Structure formats: structure tokens, C-alpha cells
Amino acid sequence: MNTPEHMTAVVQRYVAALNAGDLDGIVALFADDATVEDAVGSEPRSGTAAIREFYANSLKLPLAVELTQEVRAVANEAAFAFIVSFEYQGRKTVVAPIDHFRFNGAGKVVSMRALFGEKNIHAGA
Amino acid sequence: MNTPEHMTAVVQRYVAALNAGDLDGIVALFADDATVEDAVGSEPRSGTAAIREFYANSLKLPLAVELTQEVRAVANEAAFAFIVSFEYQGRKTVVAPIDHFRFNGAGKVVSMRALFGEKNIHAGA
Ligand SMILES: C[C@]12CCc3c(ccc4cc(O)ccc34)[C@@H]1CCC2=O
Ligand SMILES: C[C@]12CCc3c(ccc4cc(O)ccc34)[C@@H]1CCC2=O
Numbered sequence: 179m180n181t182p183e184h185m186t187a188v189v190q191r192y193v194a195a196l197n198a199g200d201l202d203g204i205v206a207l208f209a210d211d212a213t214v215e216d217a218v219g220s221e222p223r224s225g226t227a228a229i230r231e232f233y234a235n236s237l238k239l240p241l242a243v244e245l246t247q248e249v250r251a252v253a254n255e256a257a258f259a260f261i262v263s264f265e266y267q268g269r270k271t272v273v274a275p276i277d278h279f280r281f282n283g284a285g286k287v288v289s290m291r292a293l294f295g296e297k298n299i300h301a302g303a
Numbered sequence: 304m305n306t307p308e309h310m311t312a313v314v315q316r317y318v319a320a321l322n323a324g325d326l327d328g329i330v331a332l333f334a335d336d337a338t339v340e341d342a343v344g345s346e347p348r349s350g351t352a353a354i355r356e357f358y359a360n361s362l363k364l365p366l367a368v369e370l371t372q373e374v375r376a377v378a379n380e381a382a383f384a385f386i387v388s389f390e391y392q393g394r395k396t397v398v399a400p401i402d403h404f405r406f407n408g409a410g411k412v413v414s415m416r417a418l419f420g421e422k423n424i425h426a427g428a
Contacts, residue, residue, distance in 0.1 A: 219378035252420035253344035257401040276382040295377035
């Protein structure tokens with residue numbers, strides 16, 4: 179089935195995969211017809227190909243991501259607070275969002291939504 | 304309109320109202336036909352009366368609640384990590400969930416969902 183332990187584990191695999199730039203590891207977490215909403219408001223990408231392409235572009239730069247709090251998992255859902263750090267042109271940026279995963283009975287992620295705004299983007303000059 | 308600043312402010316008012324046991328202050332944040340999903344999975348209470356009753360029972364005990372991280376506000380949505388502490392029969396409990404608010408154009412909350420599980424309930428013996 180799908181348990182809080184399993185959802186928490188998936189969140190951790192997700193986080194470790196972004197760190198390793200393990201694209202197959204990330205997509206394998208999703209259902210074939212899942213949706214990924216990179217930033218709320220935007221049009222949710224659908225399907226394995228779309229999902230993989232999104233993460234592929236998100237990995238152009240080396241990312242350092244970690245959970246900053248315990249994962250919240252309950253009845254087919256999980257939400258977590260974390261940070262995604264990267265550096266560009268001598269500038270270090272740290273995006274602090276909160277993600278939400280919706281699982282199916284198979285334990286696969288059918289829906290992922292990343293929530294963050296300008297105030298959650300911490301960068302120097 | 305509805306802005307990240309306004310949504311963040313509503314989250315802070317929400318948190319301060321629970322602390323003050325200000326029931327009118329909390330309900331006033333919601334749209335008349337809003338829904339509150341106390342714990343994911345359960346049936347979402349609907350309408351002012353239902354919403355107020357839920358918070359009324361949640362305030363039977365004195366609650367100490369605070370944000371533990373920055374609020375995430377983007378396009379009609381906000382999510383936040385926080386703690387709700389209370390004491391009973393000499394036992395101190397701290398529930399650490401992540402909430403999600405959906406706003407309308409008026410800046411009112413039309414949907415609130417609290418996400419947390421047993422692993423997010425920290426209590427001693
Ligand atoms: C796209 C991005 C890399 C990945 C990423 C960002 C923000 C939120 C995320 C949420 C995720 O669940 C997975 C990856 C990201 C960054 C915004 C700036 C940047 O370089
Ligand atoms: C009901 C409760 C008081 C309020 C409350 C809890 C958990 C999550 C919440 C999320 C909210 O957005 C507002 C109030 C609560 C506690 C669980 C144990 C308890 O006494």
C-alpha cells in the first residue's frame with residue numbers, strides 16, 4: 179500500500195536524486211500520467227516525457243537540496259519544506275519552497291506542486 | 304487584490320488569533336462558503352457555522368502556535384510550516400503540521416487544509 183513511511187521515503191529519494199542529478203531516479207517516482215506544477219499558477223506539465231524534460235532543465239545547474247524540517251505525510255499525501263541552492267556568475271541563490279505530493283495506491287506520485295514566491299528566493303546582489 | 308504580502312499577513316493573523324483564542328478573528332478570515340479540512344482524508348467542514356464550530360472545539364485547550372519558517376505565498380495560495388502546542392494532564396504535546404490556504408480575489412480564504420500525521424505529533428509519555 180501507501181504509508182506515511184513510504185511517502186516520507188519517497189520525499190527523501192526525491193531530494194537525494196536532485197542532489198545527484200539522477201533524472202531516472204526522479205521520474206521513476208512518478209506515475210506515467212502524473213502532473214508536475216513547477217510553480218503554482220503555471221500550466222502543469224503532464225506525462226513522463228514532460229515531467230522528465232522539466233527536471234532535465236532544472237538540473238542544468240548543479241543543485242544542492244535538503245529538507246529543512248520533518249516531512250508531513252498523511253493519507254496519500256505528503257508536504258515538505260526544503261531548500262534548493264545553486265550558484266551562477268558568482269552569485270549564490272537559495273530557493274525555499276514547500277512541495278506537495280499526491281500518491282496513488284501503488285505508492286507512485288500522481289501529482290507534485292511546488293509552492294514558492296519571490297520572498298522565498300534568497301539571493302545576494 | 305490578493306497579494307503574497309496579503310496572504311502572508313493573513314497567515315500571521317491566523318496564527319495570532321489561535322494564540323489569543325480569537326474565534327471571530329479566525330472565522331473572519333474565511334469566505335462564507337469556505338471549507339476547512341482539519342486533517343487530510345477527513346470530510347471537509349463547509350460554511351461559516353461549521354468552520355467556527357471546528358475552531359471552537361480546537362480552542363477548548365489553550366494553544367500556543369507559531370510559524371517555524373517563512374510563509375510561502377504565490378498566486379492565490381499560501382503554505383506554511385508551524386507548531387501548535389498544548390498541555391493536558393501534565394503532558395505537553397507539540398503538533399508540527401503544514402497548512403495550505405487557497406484565497407479568492409477578495410483576499411478571503413476559500414479553502415484551508417492541514418497536513419500532518421502521527422510522526423508529526425511530538426509528545427512525551
Ligand atoms: C528551477 C530551479 C532548480 C530546481 C527547483 C527550483 C525551485 C523549486 C523546486 C521544487 C522541486 O520540487 C524540484 C526542483 C525545484 C529552482 C528555481 C531556480 C532553479 O534553478
Ligand atoms: C485539534 C488540536 C488544536 C488545533 C490544531 C491541531 C492540529 C493542526 C491545526 C492546524 C490549524 O490550521 C489550526 C489548528 C490546528 C491540534 C491537534 C491536537 C489539538 O488539540
